[PDB]
């Protein structure tokens, strides 16, 4: 992916650019410091030729400093790549100024060591660019020896060693550049993957929740969500299954039933009837949305609003009467094409309702009260095509609407009714912006929490074996650097060199014991254990650092050797080893780094000062001793500053990425928990296959979801005594305790439904105090009818038990039937699983025309359980048909 990798380069360019901002600032200090000491050395002013080139060089570094800031603000980063080239050429040119003209007469070879290391450490140039930039300085060092032949006169040999001194910078420099870039690739790759997973899970969470919120309004879904989270420690003290009901006031209830349903039911089959029903009811849902209703349920051929239930409205019944006029208009519209005569009747009443859910399975929003019963009776009144505006509503709307005298006498005269990308950039940008002053220490870059730093320390160094290899090569090169350098005790220094080169190899084999499979596992475990804990690796990293330093100084201690500046660069060749060791902490690196300079400061003062003096007089030149020890610590200063800032920036980036990874993981965990809660609620609301079909696309593309089944049993269970039991006094809040008892009954039924004995039976819905369940919907034999019969008997037993526990008598009317049904969703916007057919109406009629406490059943297709009452002869709704009743199994 060239587009993604280029996108990484734009991100990678900025982080490396932050390093060169201080290094260009570092360079301008280098020019003035060398210029100042040259001014202070001689009372007479320096050569005017000397000042001009450094003036260009000390001025261009200011320009690059003022050029990187503007490009960082700019969205493009082309000049950031150029800035590394502009900086490299500026310092690389410095060599020509010294070699041919005057330039920076101080230092010399050591200064080239500083920049040639620089162009592999802080320059945002890619790895391929670094080799070209590094080789340019190295090949120009070859030009330096030609333009300064007296340097070759100083050392006829060791000129190859001088190139070797500059060869290991390329060898060690690519190691830092490649590993640091590789680690940056993983950090960018990981932060790109984590955001991809977070966005993937958020869309699913919002899509899953959008279906749950389609039904079950928010003001009860919030209560359910709070309940399932277990907000308190435990709810070990519970006596009731709890309810989610609330009382509302100043609402209006509509109703509608098809007058001639049975006449047209026999004319056409089930599929066409379902099609017309869905068309009418979907247009009706659109009308309800237009007129501020919210439908509660669709039972058979019935449809009813609640006006202003979740939010109050001053004109609450106005919306109901307007949408009722819309009901009439839509019925007239569908009356076109001379198809049928499905005209209906509408009844409206206003009052107080109790809204909530009952039971544990297939939760559905409903309303129970006495006033909804008044609305139901007003609808059942009659005169299809006309509304009922009984006194509780006529005085509600206004006196501005003219309505007739109302019904004469159609319903029972009881109770006196009185009718009348850029995100990822801001993803990275907000990480640094928030963490400018936050959990990380402003300078030590340490997390405030001890555990957060500790869980960082346990992370293993994946390049520890490769990083320790780098320390071996540089220590091997200083051995080759010094081996050809002359000394008095050539053999005695080699014996110590052999020990030191073996000491590093001793740690090499120990730290590569895991790499050495042939070596025993116990040794391999120690290698893993070394990198497992940060402190055990820190001492080894410190240890391997020392061996490079001991090897780099022991040669000088042998000297009592006429080239004292070349032995100094070996310490510079040891300071890179600290920069190589990326993982070790920054402040710990400064403490060990401060040891290197302090020892060299002690070895560059009066001790071995005479050895520097004999070098001064031999070279002579123009006061070049300012390029000697006077500049030896000057080189050490810039090298130390560069190495320290490299370590600091590397640790800064690493800590930032770790902290953001932790934050993203926490967000992912929280979102996963929310997903689990939503999944639980959705599973409780709707069946599996229906929920899966409605979750993805084609929720509204397919207006009708339906399926035809052949062998399905249908059962109804009614409690006629609850209407007499129900009463709205003041002691019970408004009947809330009666609804609590009803919820207890329904919850007992639902819990009984969960037994393994009843696997083929699924609860469809509850109609007020009626319980409806079907048998054998999922084919996976007439055993499911037997299961349904056992379910009815168990329901009778449960109602008897709860009657015993309470202090009143309740009786169940059970109606069963068997046949072919059609199961599907009738509302695309609000998915409510439902079934239709002729056996459903037969079951409802058999339940309605029955005696309490007894089960009425059609033609007995089973001989397993014996029935009785064959001579019952119930006319029903279709035609007269005599069939039996249902006793127990025996």
């Amino acid at each position: 992916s060239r587009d993604l990798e280029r996108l990484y380069q734009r991100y990678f360019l900025g982080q490396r650019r932050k390093s060169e901002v201080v290094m260009n600032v570092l360079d301008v200090l280098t020019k003035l410091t060398l210029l100042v000491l040259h001014l202070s050395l001689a009372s007479a002013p320096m050569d005017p030729l000397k000042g001009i080139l450094l003036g260009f060089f000390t001025g261009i570094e200011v320009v690059i400093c003022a050029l990187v800031v503007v490009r960082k603000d700019t969205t493009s980063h082309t000049y950031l790549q150029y800035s590394g080239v502009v900086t490299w050429v500026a310092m690389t040119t410095q060599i020509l100024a010294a070699g041919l003209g005057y330039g920076l007469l101080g230092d010399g070879i050591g200064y080239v060591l500083f920049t040639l290391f620089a162009t592999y450490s802080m320059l945002p140039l890619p790895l391929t660019w670094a080799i070209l930039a590094g080789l340019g300085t190295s090949l120009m060092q070859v030009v330096l020896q030609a333009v300064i032949p007296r340097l070759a006169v100083i050392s006829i040999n060791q000129v190859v060693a001088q190139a070797v001194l500059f060869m290991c910078m390329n060898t060690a420099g690519i190691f830092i550049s490649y590993l640091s870039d590789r680690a940056q690739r993983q950090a960018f790759l990981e932060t790109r993957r984590c955001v991809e997973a977070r966005l993937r899970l958020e869309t699913e969470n919002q899509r899953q929740e959008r279906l749950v919120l389609s039904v079950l309004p928010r003001f009860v879904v919030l209560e359910m969500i709070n309940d399932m989270t277990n907000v308190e420690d435990e709810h070990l003290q519970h006596q009731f299954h709890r309810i989610y009901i609330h009382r509302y006031e100043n609402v209006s209830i509509l109703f509608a039933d098809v007058k001639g349903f049975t006449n047209l039911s026999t004319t056409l089959s089930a599929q066409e009837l379902v099609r017309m029903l869905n068309e009418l009811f979907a247009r009706f849902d659109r009308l309800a949305h237009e007129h501020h209703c919210l439908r509660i349920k669709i039972l058979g051929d019935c449809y009813y609003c609640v006006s202003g239930l979740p939010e109050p409205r001053q004109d609450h019944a106005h919306c109901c009467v307007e949408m009722g006029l819309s009901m009439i208009k839509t019925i007239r519209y569908v009356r076109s094409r001379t198809k049928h005569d499905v005209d209906m009747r509408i009844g409206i009443h206003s009052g107080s309702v109790l809204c909530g859910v009952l039971g544990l399975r297939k939760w559905q929003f409903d309303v129970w009260s006495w006033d909804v019963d008044i609305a139901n009776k007003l609808e059942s009144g009659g005169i299809p095509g006309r509304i009922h505006i009984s006194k509780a509503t006529l005085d509600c709307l206004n006196g501005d609407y003219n309505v007739e005298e109302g019904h004469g006498k159609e319903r029972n005269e009881f109770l006196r009714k009185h009718n009348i990308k850029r995100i990822e950039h801001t993803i990275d940008l907000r990480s640094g912006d928030k963490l400018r002053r936050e959990h990380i220490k402003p300078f030590s870059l340490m997390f405030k929490d001890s555990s957060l730093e500790h869980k960082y320390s346990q992370m293993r160094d994946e390049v520890f074996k490769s990083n320790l290899v780098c320390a071996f090569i540089v220590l091997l090169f200083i051995t080759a650097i010094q081996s050809l350098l002359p000394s008095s005790r050539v053999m005695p220094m080699a014996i110590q060199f052999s020990i030191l080169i073996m000491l590093h190899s001793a740690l090499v084999l120990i730290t590569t014991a895991e790499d050495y499979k042939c070596l025993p596992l116990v040794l391999r475990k120690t290698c893993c254990w070394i990198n497992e804990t940060y402190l055990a690796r820190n001492v080894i990293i410190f240890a391997s650092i020392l061996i490079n330093f001991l090897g780099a100084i022991l040669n000088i201690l042998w000297c009592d050797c006429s080239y004292p500046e070349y032995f100094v660069f070996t310490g510079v060749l040891a300071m890179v080893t600290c920069a190589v060791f990326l993982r070790l902490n920054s402040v710990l690196k400064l403490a060990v780094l401060l040891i290197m300079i302090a020892i060299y400061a002690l070895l560059t003062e009066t001790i071995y000062a005479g050895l520097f003096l004999r070098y001064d007089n031999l070279n002579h030149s123009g006061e070049d001793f300012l390029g000697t020890k006077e500049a030896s610590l000057l080189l050490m200063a810039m090298f130390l500053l560069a190495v320290f800032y490299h370590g600091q920036q590397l640790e800064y980036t690493a800590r930032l990425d770790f902290l953001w990874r932790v934050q993203a993981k926490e967000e992912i965990n929280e979102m996963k928990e929310l997903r689990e809660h939503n999944e639980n609620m959705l599973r409780n609301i709707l069946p599996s296959h229906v929920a899966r079909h409605f979750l993805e696309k084609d929720r509204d593309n397919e207006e009708l979801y339906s399926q035809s089944y052949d062998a399905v049993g249908v059962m109804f269970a009614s409690i006629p005594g609850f209407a007499d039991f129900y009463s709205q006094t003041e002691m019970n809040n408004q009947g809330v305790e009666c609804l609590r008892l009803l919820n207890e009954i329904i919850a007992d039924f639902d819990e009984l439904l969960g037994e393994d004995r009843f696997q083929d039976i699924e609860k469809i819905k509850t109609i007020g105090s009626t319980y409806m369940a079907v048998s054998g919907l999922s084919p996976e034999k007439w055993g499911h009818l037997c299961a349904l019969a056992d379910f009815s008997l168990a329901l009778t037993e449960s109602i008897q038990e709860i009657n015993k526990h309470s202090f009143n008598n309740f009786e169940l009317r059970i109606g069963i039937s068997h046949g072919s049904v059609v199961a599907g969703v009738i509302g695309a916007k609000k998915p409510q699983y439902d079934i239709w057919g002729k056996t459903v109406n037969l079951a409802s009629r058999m339940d309605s025309t029955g005696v309490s406490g007894r089960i009425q059943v059609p033609e007995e297709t089973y001989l397993i359980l014996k029935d009785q009452g064959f001579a019952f002869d119930y006319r029903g709704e279709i035609y007269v048909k005599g069939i039996s009743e249902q006793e127990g199994k025996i």
Partner: protein, 333 residues
């Protein structure tokens, strides 16, 4: 402040004295209709005594036959829906009450159904005959009023609020109890300990004490009262003591286990107490603790108390003890 308030309800069988307990508690810490109810109670008592003169299978001997027109007058006005209140009727009632045959008929009141406050108002015919006085609070507590629905009385003692819940006790009214079984601090079960001799007026077969025991069994094992920790309030202790002191009726005559039962080692050493009353009260209490403990799980506990709802000192002492119990219980250890 809803949690601070305590909700208490008085669940008990019929004629258990819970309403009397509520009245006494109300007058402890805070018209002509009451006079009318006293008159009606005395009226019902005298009419039932006159009817039971002849209704019982074992005939009760009468007084001097000349003093019989009074009986005919009481029988005649009893059928009248609107009973008269003339001085002549009160003279008739006093004449019956002083008669020895009527006294013997009253002594057999356990055979038929009669209010327990009959003799208190029957001793008050002379003062009620003038129909010009206001009965005292003690006479107010003797009134017999049927409780149909459930009633609440707000309470406040020592800066803490209490809630009262008076409910009916008849088998027809037991279906309304579920309306207030939620978030209740404790149940104050009241049992008429002296009703071991009589029977309930709804079936006329089961003993009142047996019905109360069945009610307590139903309440204790109720699935919606698993952790409620009922409090037991034995009532009518004075009536039980009087009945057991008379010797006409015995607890053994209706409960065979009583004869073998012995007084427990732990007892309340009341100075004005007899071994018989102690053994009777402890037999009843041990029956109730047995039925409670057989199903005991440690979730809820019962604290039996002996109470006489007529006198106010026993009421206030038992109420103080129960208030300490309810405070410790609201502590929710």
């Amino acid at each position: 402040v809803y949690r601070a308030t305590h909700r208490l309800l008085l669940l008990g069988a019929g004629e258990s004295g819970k309403s009397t307990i509520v009245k006494q508690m109300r007058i402890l810490h805070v018209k002509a209709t009451k006079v009318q109810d006293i008159k009606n109670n005395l009226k019902e008592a005298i009419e039932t005594i006159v009817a039971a003169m002849s209704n019982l299978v074992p005939p009760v001997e009468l007084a001097n036959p000349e003093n019989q027109f009074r009986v005919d007058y009481i029988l005649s006005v009893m059928n009248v829906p609107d009973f008269d209140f003339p001085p002549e009727f009160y003279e008739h009632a006093k004449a019956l009450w002083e008669d020895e045959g009527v006294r013997a008929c009253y002594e057999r009141s356990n055979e038929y159904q009669l209010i327990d406050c009959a003799q208190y108002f029957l001793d008050k015919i002379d003062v009620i005959k003038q129909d010009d006085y206001v009965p005292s609070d003690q006479d107010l507590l003797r009134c017999r009023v049927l409780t149909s629905g459930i009633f609440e009385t707000k309470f406040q003692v020592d800066k803490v609020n209490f809630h009262m819940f008076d409910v009916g006790g008849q088998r027809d009214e037991r279906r309304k109890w579920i309306q207030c079984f939620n978030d209740v601090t404790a149940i104050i079960f009241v049992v008429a300990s002296s009703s071991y001799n009589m029977v309930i007026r709804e079936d006329n077969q089961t003993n009142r004490l047996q019905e109360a025991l069945n009610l307590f069994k139903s309440i204790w094992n109720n699935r919606w009262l698993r952790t409620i920790s009922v409090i037991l309030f034995l009532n009518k202790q004075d009536l039980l003591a009087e009945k057991v002191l008379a010797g006409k009726s015995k607890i053994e005559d209706y409960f065979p286990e009583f004869a073998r039962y012995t007084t427990p080692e732990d007892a309340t050493p009341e100075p004005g107490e007899d071994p018989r009353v102690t053994r009777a009260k402890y037999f009843i209490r041990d029956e109730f603790l047995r039925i409670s403990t057989a199903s005991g799980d440690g979730r809820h506990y019962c604290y039996p108390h002996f109470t006489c709802a007529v006198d106010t000192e026993n009421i206030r002492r038992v109420f103080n003890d129960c208030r300490d119990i309810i405070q410790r219980m609201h502590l929710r250890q």
